[PDB]
Ligand binder design. Sequence first.
Ligand SMILES: c1cc2sccc2s1
Length: 162
Amino acid sequence: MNIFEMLRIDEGLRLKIYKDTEGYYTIGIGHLLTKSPDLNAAKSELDKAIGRNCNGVITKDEAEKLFNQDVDAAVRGILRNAKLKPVYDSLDAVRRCAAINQVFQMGETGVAGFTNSLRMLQQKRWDEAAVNLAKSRWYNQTPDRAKRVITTFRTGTWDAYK
Ligand SMILES: c1cc2sccc2s1
């Protein structure tokens, strides 16, 4: 297991524009195109991202390229965030993957709501952090995925992903 395999399980792989759990146009391995309800806007974003006229469809290689970029940008964003960096750097490698996963799904605006969870994670109060993490819109809207990510934060193992 590694961050790519983990997010691949959580995000799936679809080669045509689809709507994510929030109803937003997405493609590939959880590559958000736009929050606009206009499919044409999503198609434009896709074409810009890939560098060709895709008409809403990409190849596996292209999906994996966006995924590489998106994971890289997620981790780099964490390091550039003054609130997230010290917590991330305090974590072991497996729990760092849980952090990347959460940021990938929710963005940094999303994880900003998690001050108390972050503090508990930095304190290595794992069971307490896990309880706090579940008291969230995130958990309630995507409970099976959040449970996996939370188990990863709780245990520092890959048990939830096999
Ligand atoms: C850096 C650390 C942590 S813990 C949950 C999200 C993030 S980002």
